Design a protein around this nucleic acid. Structure first.
Ligand code: MG
Ligand code: MG
Ligand code: MG
Ligand code: MG
Ligand code: MG
Ligand code: MG
Ligand code: MG
Ligand code: MG
Ligand code: MG
Ligand code: MG
Ligand code: MG
Ligand code: MG
Ligand code: MG
Ligand code: MG
Ligand code: MG
Ligand code: MG
Ligand code: MG
Ligand code: MG
Ligand code: MG
Ligand code: MG
Ligand code: MG
Ligand code: MG
Ligand code: MG
Ligand code: MG
Ligand code: MG
Ligand code: MG
Ligand code: MG
Ligand code: MG
Ligand code: MG
Ligand code: MG
Ligand code: MG
Ligand code: MG
Ligand code: MG
Ligand code: MG
Ligand code: MG
Ligand code: MG
Ligand code: MG
Ligand code: MG
Ligand code: MG
Ligand code: MG
Ligand code: MG
Ligand code: MG
Ligand code: MG
Ligand code: MG
Ligand code: MG
Ligand code: MG
Ligand code: MG
Ligand code: MG
Ligand code: MG
Ligand code: MG
Ligand code: MG
Ligand code: MG
Ligand code: MG
Ligand code: MG
Ligand code: MG
Ligand code: MG
Ligand code: MG
Ligand code: MG
Ligand code: MG
Lengths: 122, 56, 120, 209, 114
RNA sequence: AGGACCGAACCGACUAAUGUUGAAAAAUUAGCGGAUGACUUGUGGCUGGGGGUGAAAGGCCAAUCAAACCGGGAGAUAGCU
RNA sequence: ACACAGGUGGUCAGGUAGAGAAUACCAAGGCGCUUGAGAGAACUCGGGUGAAGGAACUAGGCAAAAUGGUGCCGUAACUUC
RNA sequence: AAUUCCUUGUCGGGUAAGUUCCGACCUGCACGAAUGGCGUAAUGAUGGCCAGGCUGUCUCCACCCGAGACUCAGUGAAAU
RNA sequence: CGAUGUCGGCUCAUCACAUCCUGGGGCUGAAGUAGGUCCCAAGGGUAUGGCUGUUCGCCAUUUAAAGUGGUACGCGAGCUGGGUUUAGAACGUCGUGAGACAGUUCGGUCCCUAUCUGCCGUGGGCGCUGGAGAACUGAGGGGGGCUGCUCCUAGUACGAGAGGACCGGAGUGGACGCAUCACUGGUGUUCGGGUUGUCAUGCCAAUGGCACUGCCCGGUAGCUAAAUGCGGAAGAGAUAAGUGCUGAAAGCAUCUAAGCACGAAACUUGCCCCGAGAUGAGUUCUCCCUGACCCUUUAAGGGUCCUGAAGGAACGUUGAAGACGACGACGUUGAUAGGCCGGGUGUGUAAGCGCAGCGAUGCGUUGAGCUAACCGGUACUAAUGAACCGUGAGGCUUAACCU
């Protein structure tokens, strides 16, 4: 799903475009993380103006995945790519002020209500 | 991997104890032809369960 | 593992199996009786009886289907003309198998397989 | 405690009003008739033997027919036994039904799992396959090492090897019960149960609960 | 499997419109909430259908904000509520998985005239 | 025009797997290099052992080479097993 | 050493597609390789497909996967031009 | 450095992390000018390093198609 | 030394406790949180990468923790071959030289069909004292036992503040294990379709063979994980360190000498599985056999005839059972397999004909035709009248009764 060495697109105006997962946080030997799970990433593209630069190491939350989420309804929701929203290393708060593309209900938790509010759909 | 000691005729026979054959001890007869035949098989003449197979 | 599967390999690949069954079905249709191994006859049932069921109804499309599945105008014509009406009212079970001992060259179980009516 | 014997019909789903799909396993639990009652005097334990019907007559041997002649006069596929706890309920010819599970919320469900026959290493013990390239010589699914050296000089008992897998009784330990419908001999339990369709199984109220 | 069949009929629905692959449908999904239950619209092209009685399902691709966003609905579920057809495309295929890599202007489907 | 280029026959033998009481006392399968030249190949001839030949590896000289094979001195000698 | 998956010089060489003596299917012609019959288990060998990830494997991208044709356009540093 | 023991020398670049690699420093244990010195376009089944694509190499294996292995009939070895 | 293959890695492990995490305690220069040190405790658990041949090591980034050691520095008749002790070549250095370096550098054949012990599975024989079919008891053995975070108690106890609990409840995760295909997916060379080259069926049309299943798109059943259900417990007994009550020796004191009470993931049990070859061979229910005669060295003696039960085996149709055995269902008083009928599923509008168009092609008949393993039915085919094995009332002594 989302594991180490996985390349993710960026879904906020932080100016990173491409990031790489370097660790799946939470628990020992954990293999991969799904939607709504914090992971450790490193910047790879870092457009010029931006708010971050190449080589930075910080947090991120997966918002879209190609595998999707099932949940009790029995339905599935797949996407065409893997995307994440960069978070502050310590405060774990979003860095960008914009959200691009749809999000999914698993982000409804208290910790990501700002992402839910800023998301254009769902 | 090869033997380190030559095994005995006793061990040879003990191993072969399970190699004995078994006889059919079951030869059914056809009420018409009267021939003894293997069960559920046609007769050497061409009969089975009274009827004459291999014919019109 | 084999669970609820059907059809046996006969130690052949798919193309060889299909060609062998086509030839055997043609031979059985032509001769009305053949000598073969028991598993081979048990498999040949499932290939030959459907052909007779198809021949039950006569139409150009059915002729073309039978020709596609047999590739022999001789036995295709023998169907739809002789084996069709001969059974007509019989619902399945057009062939019977009878064990006939073992084969001298390799001790393989042998069995005759023939049409039930037996040309009567 | 008192349980019942049923047949695995298959798996299906139930949709709730709140948009939740529960996967259930259908268990057909026909009437179970008591054929014998064990007590502490004749035997040393208190239990009851039960049977489920639907068996033909010509396949019943004289000993079994004589055993059934004890106020059961009805053959069944087999005989099962349940240890009887306190309470001392009516025993002989009671014909317990599926209504017994109209109040329990958990069940264990015991049955014989599917038979693999071969197991094999890797598949049987979740062993890790060795590499596929980089020189590996004819050793991909093989187990590897099975002992240390001359010091032990042998292989220990219980070593994980290739053998038979499946085709043995297993319990699932406190499944949830969804619906217990009468007039149809049906018992719906959430989740999967061991065995194949049409196989017999023993339903028994959960002991952990 | 008479028992299972009769169990499934009790939940099978009787208001499923006849929609075909390649048609654009509009699905009203229930959005469960504490006390704010309401419908939500989902429009897209039907790229796959699975007919299994009570276990029937179908996939709809919405292509929103540059990403495909597919969605697999269970036909006989109380969450689907209602479904309607808006277009009738001609595709002469059962599965339209090539639309995943097609995208662009090539992702359009000619309408089926009748 | 080219000790030019890509690539069959042809001549080689860089990688992997198999084989290792082999189908084979060095081979098979898939890839790989040269392929008008210092090229490759058929037939015949010459160079003979402290010698030959060697774009050199102590390589090759009849499945044997830091001194070929056959016969003889010869029952060499062996404070060793 | 074998009725041995090896080696052995020359000549002839058709049709369709193809630049072609490559490759595919065929003609003339010649063959099915001197143990079989069943089953459809681990494991080995030779292959096909694979969700998400895409070198994290490993001494090493070993092996696999991938590129691959004709015509036209277009093509950098450096250079013995 | 195909040469440097101390040594993974120090600095810079690359990575997230680089005993390898590239550019410098000069304290050259123990470079050096036909046992040639320093460069060099082209070439290489040559050694080292990096990137794109690609993938069952791998997370982590799953299924399938054939040849053996297994059973029946015939023949019938070997090291020890 | 008439051969015990050496470093590292992979796979698979098992033991010790001088305990890394989790568990229980004493002391603290322990206010709380968080720490230090010592005692008891081995049930379970105990990281992925970058660099190097590298075990180690440094670094990045996690975890409750990333324990220390033994096992031929465990493990090459399990794998690898990077380092390292063959042959090629080069650098520096030493030597006049052949050559050498425990200096560096590029390249460089890893054999074995398992006899015995051992281990993982699965069978045959006999025994268990008339024979047979079932259900059990349970001596004994094995499996399992991990843990994070969030919320309430409570912003409470504690503190000047910052900060922030023990005890007790609820929820949701990581890793691991068992089961199962209802769902989401993989596969599906046995189903449908598209298409390239070429050959053939006299030709058109329509089909088949070959080219990796020619290439490719979908996909039934089955098997499957990534998919979804469950698990680890609570409780009880006896304890370790420790804490005690009462109480003398020793007028006091003292947890101990007599007596009594608490006390941990360790121990026994509780949970799951195997289990009467448990030769100590156990228990319960049911079923079957109750005819004559001869001989001898006269006792668990031999033999002739009659008899052949319960049941078993064999054979056949087979299975979500299986290497073969074994195990399960069925054998005409039958749905066991095949076929057939209907349905379902998959594919996607068959052939022929008609119309439009110069033609490729399109439209109607038409959601058509075909459709494996699936579902519900159906004796059409194959499962035979029989034969075979297994017997004829079951030893002695003693104890309690009937005589
Ligand atoms: Mg010896
Ligand atoms: Mg079947
Ligand atoms: Mg064979
Ligand atoms: Mg083919
Ligand atoms: Mg099975
Ligand atoms: Mg592994
Ligand atoms: Mg090898
Ligand atoms: Mg040239
Ligand atoms: Mg060339
Ligand atoms: Mg070589
Ligand atoms: Mg070759
Ligand atoms: Mg060249
Ligand atoms: Mg030399
Ligand atoms: Mg030689
Ligand atoms: Mg000499
Ligand atoms: Mg002399
Ligand atoms: Mg001598
Ligand atoms: Mg001496
Ligand atoms: Mg030959
Ligand atoms: Mg030859
Ligand atoms: Mg030649
Ligand atoms: Mg196979
Ligand atoms: Mg393989
Ligand atoms: Mg492949
Ligand atoms: Mg496919
Ligand atoms: Mg993949
Ligand atoms: Mg993919
Ligand atoms: Mg990529
Ligand atoms: Mg690694
Ligand atoms: Mg390669
Ligand atoms: Mg390739
Ligand atoms: Mg060095
Ligand atoms: Mg790298
Ligand atoms: Mg440098
Ligand atoms: Mg020099
Ligand atoms: Mg000079
Ligand atoms: Mg063999
Ligand atoms: Mg044999
Ligand atoms: Mg011999
Ligand atoms: Mg020796
Ligand atoms: Mg201790
Ligand atoms: Mg315990
Ligand atoms: Mg070692
Ligand atoms: Mg060790
Ligand atoms: Mg060993
Ligand atoms: Mg080793
Ligand atoms: Mg080496
Ligand atoms: Mg244990
Ligand atoms: Mg299914
Ligand atoms: Mg699928
Ligand atoms: Mg096909
Ligand atoms: Mg044509
Ligand atoms: Mg042909
Ligand atoms: Mg051909
Ligand atoms: Mg306890
Ligand atoms: Mg006192
Ligand atoms: Mg049937
Ligand atoms: Mg349909
Ligand atoms: Mg067609």
């Amino acid at each position: 799903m989302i594991q180490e060495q996985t390349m993710l697109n960026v879904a906020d105006n932080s100016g990173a475009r491409r990031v790489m997962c370097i660790k799946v946080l939470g628990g020992s030997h954990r293999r991969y993380a799904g939607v709504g799970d914090i992971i450790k990433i490193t910047i790879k593209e870092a457009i010029p103006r931006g708010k971050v630069k190449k080589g930075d190491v910080l947090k991120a939350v997966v918002v879209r995945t190609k595998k999707g989420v099932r949940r009790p309804d029995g339905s599935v929701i797949r996407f065409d790519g893997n995307a994440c929203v960069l978070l502050n290393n310590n405060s774990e708060q979003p860095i960008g002020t914009r959200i691009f593309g749809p999000v999914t209900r698993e982000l409804r938790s208290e910790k990501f209500m700002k992402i839910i509010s800023l998301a254009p759909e769902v | 991997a090869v033997q380190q000691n030559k095994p005995t005729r006793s061990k040879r026979g003990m191993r072969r104890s399970h190699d004995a054959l078994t006889a059919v001890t079951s030869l059914s007869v056809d009420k018409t032809s009267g021939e003894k035949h293997l069960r559920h098989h046609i007769t050497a003449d061409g009969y089975y369960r009274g009827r004459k197979v291999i014919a019109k | 593992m084999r669970h609820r599967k059907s059809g046996r390999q006969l130690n052949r690949n798919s193309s060889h199996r299909q060609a062998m069954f086509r030839n055997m079905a043609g031979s059985l249709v032509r001769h009305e009786i053949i000598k073969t191994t028991l598993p081979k006859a048990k498999e040949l049932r499932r290939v030959v009886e459907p052909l007779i069921t198809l021949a039950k109804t006569d139409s150009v499309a059915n002729r073309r289907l039978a020709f596609a599945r047999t590739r022999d105008n001789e036995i295709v014509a023998k169907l739809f003309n002789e084996l069709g009406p001969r059974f007509a009212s019989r619902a399945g079970g057009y062939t019977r198998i009878l064990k006939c001992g073992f084969r001298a060259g390799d001790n393989a179980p042998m069995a005759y397989i023939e049409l039930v009516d037996r040309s009567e | 405690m008192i349980g019942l014997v049923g047949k695995k019909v298959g798996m299906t789903r139930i949709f709730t009003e709140d948009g939740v799909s529960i996967p259930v396993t259908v268990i057909e639990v026909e009437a179970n008739r008591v054929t014998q009652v064990k007590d502490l005097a004749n035997d040393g334990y208190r239990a009851i033997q039960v049977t489920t019907g639907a068996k033909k007559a010509n396949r019943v041997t004289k000993p079994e027919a004589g055993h059934f002649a004890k106020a059961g006069v009805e053959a069944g596929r087999g005989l099962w036994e349940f240890r009887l706890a306190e309470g001392e309920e009516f025993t002989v010819g009671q014909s317990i039904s599926v209504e017994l599970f109209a109040d329990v919320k958990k069940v264990d469900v015991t049955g014989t799992s599917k038979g693999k026959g071969f197991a094999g290493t890797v598949k049987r013990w979740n062993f890790r396959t060795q590499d596929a390239t980089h020189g590996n010589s004819l050793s991909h699914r093989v187990p590897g090492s099975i002992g240390q050296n001359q010091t032990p000089g042998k292989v220990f008992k219980g070593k994980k090897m290739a053998g038979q897998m499946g085709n043995e009784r297993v319990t699932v330990q406190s499944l949830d019960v969804v619906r217990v419908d009468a007039e149809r001999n049906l018992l719906l339990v959430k989740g999967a149960v061991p065995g194949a369709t049409g196989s017999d199984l023993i339903v028994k109220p959960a002991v952990k609960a | 499997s008479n028992i299972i069949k009769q169990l499934e009929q009790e939940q099978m629905k009787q208001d499923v419109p006849s929609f075909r692959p390649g048609d654009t449908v509009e699905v009203k999904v229930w959005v469960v909430e504490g006390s704010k239950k309401r419908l939500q619209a989902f429009e897209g092209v039907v790229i796959a259908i699975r007919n299994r009685g009570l276990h029937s399902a179908f996939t709809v691709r919405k292509i929103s904000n540059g990403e495909g966003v597919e969605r697999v609905f269970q036909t006989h579920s109380p969450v689907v509520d209602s479904i309607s057809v808006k277009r009738r495309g001609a595709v002469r295929k059962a599965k339209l998985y090539y639309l995943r890599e097609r995208t662009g202007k090539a992702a359009r489907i000619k309408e089926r005239l009748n």
